[PDB]
């Protein structure tokens, strides 16, 4: 069964992060990615 549906907004995924006060995260590895910006 396929039909038109109405849903509330998906504001985003819930990201769980812990501030603490004696913990740091540092990126071990990195990625390079090119993105296209189109301007008339």
């Amino acid at each position: 069964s396929q039909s038109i549906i109405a849903y509330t907004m998906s504001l985003g995924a819930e990201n769980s992060v812990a501030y603490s006060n004696n913990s740091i995260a540092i990126p071990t590895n990195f990625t390079i990615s090119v993105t296209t910006e189109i301007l008339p």
Binding site: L11, G12, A13, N15, V17, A18, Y19, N21
Partner: protein
């Protein structure tokens, strides 16, 4: 306009427990859990005014 000014990042982040932010007191700007709205105290003053 409001989409590109307000949703530059589309990753929602929960409010951390307000404890030991180095003495920096983020009660005014962060939304208090006293009300079910996600509005802060100065945000409420701006919306009322």
């Amino acid at each position: 306009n409001t989409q590109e000014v307000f949703a530059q990042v589309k990753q929602i982040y929960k409010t951390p427990p307000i404890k030991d932010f180095g003495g920096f007191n983020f009660s005014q700007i962060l939304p208090d859990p006293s009300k079910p709205s996600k509005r802060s105290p100065i945000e409420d003053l701006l919306f009322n005014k």
